[PDB]
Ligand binder design. Structure first.
Ligand SMILES: Cn1c(N2CCS(=O)(=O)CC2)cc(OCc2cc(F)c(Oc3ccc(Cl)c(C(F)(F)F)c3)c(F)c2)nc1=O
Length: 369
């Protein structure tokens, strides 16, 4: 696997939590500082249906699903699966929202680095039919059996795109909020039976959250999810939008976001009509920051940027001109500086305060647009 280990001093564990078991319940992947660093064995894409899901998203035949599955079906990402949570400290919490065509496990590079710097991360799987695929259970006994019910991406007609994308970003914000509630409630002793039978005991999460230091982060569609979630839920104290796709937002959200907001853009994805929505969020009484990662493409924020070689990567637009490790470090470090400054963290992340300003050879302050 070429998915980067986290650059931070904590060891990183991973597990999955679904609660309740239904289609309206919460599904998320957890990355967290783990007690021991025994084995980086987490299955990156853990079900065949996601490869089928991806193929349907990409426009590909029925065979490409099996091809992708053959290429990546056993690839790991460097986190200790179900490793005990590192005790003795409350950690700041991040809720992460995946982009269109993605699902909870495709942003592990981002998540693992955050976790290795002291964060618990909850990457939610959206059930708005924006994920290539996702599942839930029809009743308790199905959950007990692992008898899954799969939900696949919804292709939209042009007539639909305005209404349905806005309905989806609303649902998405509600799922970020629901997920946050699940964690906060586990943090304060709510007994939960995970709908997945995993070794990780959710009891460990009791009193492990620093409840004042919460952020929502999100890529593309997830970028828009960030802005919508902020406007609804003041439990999120800041937001970080990775190359947001602003189209889903109604004009009412811009006036309603008090919390700090950080836009991190790829150089090659942005276009004026999208950027102008980002500038709408700007007000003298608010903190908004924007940097552009030089020579990066849209997919630089997702794990598939580390899934192929240089040439194939460029061909598929999984990779930009910039090295994918240099990109995602600049994005993780800028973020860490932003999270420290606005969550009030007592760590050394402010050593990358310059990166919030785009003060790097590989950063454009603001936007080229
Ligand atoms: C709104 N949006 C996106 N777009 C809006 C601008 S557009 O030009 O009109 C269309 C794209 C892309 C995206 O990407 C998230 C994402 C999707 C995937 F399918 C991913 O997985 C991929 C992505 C690409 C590829 Cl080629 C493959 C592979 F199977 F072929 F390897 C897998 C992924 F990592 C992230 N998430 C988004 O939310």
């Amino acid at each position: 696997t070429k998915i980067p280990r986290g650059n931070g001093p904590y060891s990183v564990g991973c597990t999955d939590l679904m609660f309740d078991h239904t289609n309206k319940g919460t599904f998320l992947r957890l990355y967290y500082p783990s007690q021991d660093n025994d084995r980086l064995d987490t299955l990156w894409i853990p079900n065949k249906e996601y490869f089928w899901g991806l193929s349907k998203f990409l426009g590909t035949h029925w065979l490409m699903g099996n091809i992708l599955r053959l290429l990546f079906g056993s690839m790991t990402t460097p986190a200790n699966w179900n490793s005990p949570l590192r005790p003795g400290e409350k950690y700041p919490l991040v809720v992460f929202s995946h982009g269109l065509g993605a699902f909870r496990t495709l942003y592990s590079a981002i998540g693992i680095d955050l976790a290795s710097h002291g964060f618990i991360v909850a990457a939610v799987e959206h059930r708005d039919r924006s994920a290539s695929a996702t599942y839930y259970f029809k009743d308790q006994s199905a959950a007990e059996i692992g008898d899954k019910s799969w939900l696949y991406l919804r292709t939209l007609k042009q007539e639909e795109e305005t209404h349905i994308r806005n309905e989806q970003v609303r649902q998405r914000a509600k799922e970020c909020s629901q997920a946050l509630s699940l964690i906060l409630d586990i943090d304060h002793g709510k007994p939960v039976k995970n709908a997945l039978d995993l070794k990780f005991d959710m009891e460990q999460l009791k009193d492990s959250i620093d409840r004042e230091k919460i952020a929502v982060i999100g890529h593309s569609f997830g970028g828009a999810t960030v802005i919508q979630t902020l406007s609804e839920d003041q439990r999120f104290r800041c937001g970080i939008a990775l190359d947001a796709w602003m189209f889903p937002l109604g004009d009412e959200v811009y006036s309603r976001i008090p919390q700090p907001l950080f836009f991190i853009n790829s150089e090659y994805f942005q276009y004026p009509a999208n950027i102008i929505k980002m500038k709408k969020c700007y007000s003298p009484d608010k903190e908004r920051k924007m940097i552009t990662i030089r020579g990066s493409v849209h997919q630089n924020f997702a794990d598939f940027t580390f899934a192929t070689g240089k040439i194939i990567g460029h061909m598929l637009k999984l990779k930009g001109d910039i090295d994918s490790n240099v990109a995602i470090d600049l994005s993780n470090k800028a973020s860490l500086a932003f999270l420290q400054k606005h969550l009030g963290l007592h760590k050394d992340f402010d050593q990358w305060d310059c990166l919030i300003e785009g003060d790097d050879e590989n950063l454009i302050p603001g936007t080229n647009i």
